[PDB]
Amino acid sequence: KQVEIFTDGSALGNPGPGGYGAILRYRGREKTFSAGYTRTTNNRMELMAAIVALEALKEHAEVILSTDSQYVRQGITQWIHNWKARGWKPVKNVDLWQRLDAALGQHQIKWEWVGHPENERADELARAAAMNPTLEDTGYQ
């Protein structure tokens, strides 16, 4: 019952137009997730990509999440546990981190920090979305 998730973000500014791209692969078949925002950051899009994808799952499963985000990696391996222990204090992009934390709750997540062409596919989706934003990142306050 393993499921592969590949994510990436893109941003043409900080803040600026941005987008996320996620590839959800299971049993040779895969689903795609991407959307662009008018004003956001790559960091937020990186998180958003994981969130949308994990929340697409309607049942517990072994998930292998692959991403080249240095932000997500640091957050997950060095900050997350401390933020939760301190009562999420709030912390920058707390809205997304808490959202992701929840999603990663009902799942057996195995992280793969970046060889898969799928990561490039996510990159392409995120960049395309950043160039054609249709949403607003209400969380970027």
| 8 sits near Mn ion (criterion: CB under 5 A) | yes
Give 39: exposed, middle or buried? Use CB within 10 Å, 0-12, 13-18, 19+.
middle
Radius of gyration of the chain (CA): 14
The residue of the chain with the least Cβ separation from Mn ion equals: 123
Q: Which stretch binds Mn ion (CB under 5 A): 24-32, 67-75, 83-91, 132-140?
A: 67-75
Q: Of 104, 114, 40, whose CA–CA distance to 73 is shortest?
A: 114
| 68 sits near Mn ion (criterion: CB under 5 A) | yes
**What DSSP letter does each residue of 28-51 carry, written as one string?**
TEEEEEEEEEEEE-HHHHHHHHHH
> In the bound complex, what is the minimum distance in angstroms from residue 128's beta carbon to Mn ion?
12
The answer for residues whose C-beta is within 8 angstroms of residue 52's C-beta and 6 or more apart is 20, 22, 33, 35
| Nearer to Mn ion (CB atom), residue 68 or residue 101 | 68
| 124 sits near Mn ion (criterion: CB under 5 A) | no
Q: Which stretch binds Mn ion (CB under 5 A): 48-56, 60-68, 70-78, 88-96?
A: 60-68
One residue of 123, 124, 128, 140 binding Mn ion per CB under 5 A: 123
Q: Which stretch binds Mn ion (CB under 5 A): 80-88, 108-116, 118-126, 129-137?
A: 118-126
Q: Between β-strands 16-26 and 29-40, what pairing exists: parallel, antiparallel or unpaired?
A: antiparallel
Binding site for Mn ion (CB under 5 A): 8, 68-69, 123
